[PDB]
Design a protein around this ligand. Structure first.
Ligand SMILES: [Cu+]
Ligand SMILES: [Cu+]
Ligand SMILES: [Cu+]
Ligand SMILES: [Cu+]
Lengths: 296, 297
């Protein structure tokens, strides 16, 4: 019975299991910007682009010219020269605006009077070109999409989850993303969410994470690990060190108000993270010796 | 919507059951280890036709032997029986011999025919199989030398690899389902279960020691064994899968008032398993829905 001993204590509570997981990265199918062709027309220009580039605000991409409107709008044009009640001209401007013509061009046909055709469609938001490439002069009708833009303000990782473990997960703090490529600063998480779709091969649920990406960083199909921390229904837990065995004999020490140490027989359950969880043997309150010293 | 050819499902509160197969090897108890040691300084005889592989059905004859020293004591009692001596002291010397290591059956046999007890033969303690037992002829043996050693076949130990995360979710023997490729059997009945402290460092694994009754004994320690484990889940809303419908964003089924009237009530799923699903927010607990239901618009 030395004196250079530390006193611990049985605490009630649960254990924390960790695990690392295969994370493939993805482009949010939500931060996409599509440009669609409201009317069936023809193309010219195109600009110098490939399928995967950067944009500033969208700015100008490929310009069209269309036949179907000029015929119709012209009748309007002479209707403004010859006698035509206000209501007449509006009807026409209405059938043209409905047929698809941008507002900015109509008001600037009524003001310049000079018939309109070459339209430049300035792309939305910032972002990264996805799809595209279609160029030169092609025949377009009815809204067909000619391009997209992918966002990188939110980014997507998806881990494979075993179903029971997946069911336990109910909070963002247990996740912990790490990435080989960019150690540097860590990578805050904005959202987590499970896709009830139960993979039939691996008994794996899809668990999606959204990622706070400002300065870019992550591309398609990089490499990332996702350590998570599960738990367990609470057990009487003690420091592993304060515990000892060797054979079939396993147990430790009890400290008293009247400081005298009496060995007590206990039976362990699990022991992860450096803390054991006892099946039976001790009571919640009892104190215990951690990293101490005694003499037989 | 008038004729009713339908089944009804009570919605309920409760957990879910996840099945999982696990690798199992078969093993012998370190506990059944029964060694046979010498009761004293003696010498050898016989050594029955036994190899290492052979199974001793019961405790049966391992060998014969004779013992010196021992002898001085037996005959001394023999003069006392003749020349009327202290019955108490004769029993004392017998207790000292029965203390040295003399079987009760042979001392009975001695008073019966009287013939001093010459050589006696030892018989194995436990049923099973010999694991080392080579000595033959007659050699010199002193103290507690292990002459022979045996392995038990009555209980058999099968170990599975467990994930410590899924570990504490075990709780009872009925979840385990034990199956071996070797044979479809009448009794793959497991008696006891327990966990070893050892964790698999590289990949987190507990070693789940199981113990299976093996009277028939047709289980070899090399065999392969598949363990269908079953896990559970914090109680959720429980609906039979057959009656849950979607293949798009639409996420619901039939809601019944019990008034015989059907209605589209929207729900959100959490997960599915083993033939039913659990709903992370959607319907009420007692609400009725319809599996097996069949009709149109
Ligand atoms: Cu127009
Ligand atoms: Cu426990
Ligand atoms: Cu004897
Ligand atoms: Cu749940």
């Amino acid at each position: 019975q030395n004196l250079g001993v530390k006193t611990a204590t049985v605490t009630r509570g649960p254990l924390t299991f960790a695990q690392s997981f295969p994370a493939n990265v993805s482009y949010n199918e939500y931060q996409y910007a599509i440009v669609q062709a409201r009317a069936a027309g023809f193309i010219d220009k195109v600009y110098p682009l490939t399928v995967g580039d950067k944009v500033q605000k969208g700015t100008p991409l490929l310009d069209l010219t269309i036949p179907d409107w000029v015929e119709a709008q012209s009748e309007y044009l002479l209707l403004r020269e010859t006698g035509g009640t206000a209501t007449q001209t509006e009807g026409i401007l209405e059938r043209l605006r409905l047929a698809g013509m941008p507002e900015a061009d109509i008001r600037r046909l009524i003001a310049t009077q000079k018939i309109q055709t070459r339209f430049t469609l300035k792309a939305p938001i910032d972002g990264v070109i996805t799809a595209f490439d279609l160029r030169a002069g092609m025949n377009i009708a009815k809204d067909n999409v000619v391009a997209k833009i992918q966002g990188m303000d939110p980014v997507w990782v998806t881990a494979a989850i075993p179903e029971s473990i997946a069911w336990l997960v109910k909070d963002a703090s247990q996740f912990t993303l790490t990435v080989p490529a960019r150690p540097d600063k860590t990578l805050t998480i904005r959202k987590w969410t499970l896709l009830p779709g139960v993979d039939a091969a691996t008994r794996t649920l899809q668990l999606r994470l959204e990622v706070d990406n400002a300065d870019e960083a992550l591309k398609p199909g990089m490499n990332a690990w996702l350590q998570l921390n599960t738990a367990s229904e609470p057990m009487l837990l003690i420091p592993s060190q304060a515990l000892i065995d060797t054979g079939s004999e396993q147990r430790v020490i009890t400290v008293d108000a009247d400081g005298r140490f009496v060995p007590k027989r206990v039976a362990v359950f699990q022991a992860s993270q450096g803390v054991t969880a006892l099946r039976s043997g001790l009571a919640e309150g009892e104190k215990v010796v951690s990293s101490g010293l005694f003499l037989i």
